[PDB]
Amino acid sequence: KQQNFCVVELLPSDPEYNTVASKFNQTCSHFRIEKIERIQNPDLWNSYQAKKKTMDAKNGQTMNEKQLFHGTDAGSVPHVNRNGFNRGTYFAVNANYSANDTYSRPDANGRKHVYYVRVLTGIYTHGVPPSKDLYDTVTDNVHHPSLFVAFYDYQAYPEYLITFRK
Ligand SMILES: Cc1ccc2c(c1)sc1nncn12
Ligand SMILES: [Cl-]
């Protein structure tokens, strides 16, 4: 109920650091990563896994989960670490979209913040979502997606926080 959280800084030698950095670097290699943090929020995580289990029981062969990017300002980081994206919310397939200064506002020290988020994209359509008993998310392009919009609580887990600069 409280959704208390811990913030674990990944050592550069932690396998997960290389894994998160490689995905970011598909489109953001020109930026300098200062740190990557794991957000540990047992209540938020349990709530997210509850919704994943329901969606996994519903959508047959659908791979319901994707790992997507979300840019935030520095000030929102404690809010997202506690609440996730519960309010819909825009998630990018590529980091360079989230890395735009409008979505990852540089702070007073030039530092930018993008989460690498577990998102239950489930079954989606072009765009609360419409009928079909609704779609799980809407996307810009059903066959070549670059962004997803989630409207439901506990549909996203802010697993990793990337702090970086120009
Ligand atoms: C239209 C739109 C709105 C928000 C948004 C994107 C695209 S890509 C991204 N990454 N974090 C936030 N966002
Ligand atoms: Cl914090």
Numbering used by the authors: 1613 to 1699, 1712 to 1751, 1757 to 1761, 1768 to 1801
Paper text:
The human diphtheria toxin-like ARTD family contains PARP and tankyrase (TNKS) enzymes that can catalyze both mono-ADP-ribosylation (MAR, mono-ARTs) as well as generate elongated and branched chains of poly-ADP-ribose (PAR, poly-ARTs). The PARPs and TNKSs form a family of structurally and functionally diverse enzymes, which are involved in the regulation of various key biological and pathological processes such as DNA repair, cell differentiation, gene transcription, and signal transduction pathways. PARPs and TNKSs use nicotinamide adenine dinucleotide, NAD+, to transfer an ADP-ribose (ADPr) unit onto target proteins or nucleic acids with the release of nicotinamide. Here, we report our contribution in identifying a set of compounds based on a new nicotinamide mimicking chemotype,triazolo[3,4-b]benzothiazole (TBT), able to inhibit different PARP family enzymes with submicromolar activity depending on the substitution pattern around the central core. The binding mode of the TBT scaffold was studied through the synthesis of analogues and their complex crystal structures with PARP2, TNKS2, PARP14, and PARP15.
We previously screened a compound library from the open chemical repository of the National Cancer Institute, which led to the identification of the potent and selective PARP10 inhibitor OUL35.27 From the same screening, a TBT derivative OUL40 (NSC295701) emerged, showing an IC50 = 3.2 μM against PARP10. Indeed, when assayed against a panel of two poly-ARTs, PARP2 and TNKS2, and two additional mono-ARTs, PARP14 and PARP15, IC50 values in the low micromolar range (1.2–5.3 μM) were obtained. With X-ray crystallography, we confirmed the binding of 1 into the nicotinamide binding pocket of TNKS2, PARP14, and PARP15 active sites. The inhibitor binding mode is highly similar in all three enzymes, where two hydrogen bonds are generated between N1 and N2 of the triazole ring with glycine and serine residues, respectively. In addition, π–π interactions are present between the inhibitor core and tyrosine residues. Compound 1 showed IC50 of 1.2 μM against PARP14. PARP14 mediates gene transcription through its MARylation activity, and it has been implied as a possible therapeutic target, for example, in lymphoma, myeloma, hepatocellular carcinoma, and in prostate cancer. At the moment, the most advanced inhibitor for PARP14 is RBN-012759, disclosed by Ribon Therapeutics, with an IC50 of 3 nM.
